[PDB]
């Protein structure tokens, strides 16, 4: 199951890179980067409320670049403070890498 939430829904055979894929991936990635559980993270909550500091934000932006073979910086963490925003941008890049 590539999307195993705590209590939300799952999706069927989705070969494309859907928003939920990156959002849920980013959740695990955010909770670990903040030394916490995915049980506290929200899709619509600001990373700073989860504990995202300016240092943690700039180092975590690198994890995502490596994860998708992209290039982003701390500017992303300040323009997209939520998983839905952070995932939305990447969704388009991934959905476009395999035109």
Automatic annotation (TrEMBL):
<feature type="domain" description="Carrier">
    <location>
        <begin position="17"/>
        <end position="94"/>
    </location>
</feature>
<protein>
    <submittedName>
        <fullName>CurA</fullName>
    </submittedName>
</protein>
């Amino acid at each position: 199951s590539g999307l195993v939430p705590r209590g939300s829904h799952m999706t069927p055979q989705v070969n494309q890179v859907n928003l939920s894929e990156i959002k849920q991936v980013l959740k695990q990635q955010l909770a670990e980067a903040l030394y916490t559980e995915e049980s506290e993270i929200a899709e619509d909550q600001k990373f700073v409320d989860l504990g995202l500091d300016s240092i943690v934000g700039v180092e975590w932006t690198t994890t995502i670049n490596q994860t998708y073979n992209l290039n982003l910086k701390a500017t992303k963490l300040y323009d997209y403070p939520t998983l839905l925003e952070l995932s939305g941008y990447i969704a388009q890049i991934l959905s476009s890498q395999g035109t």
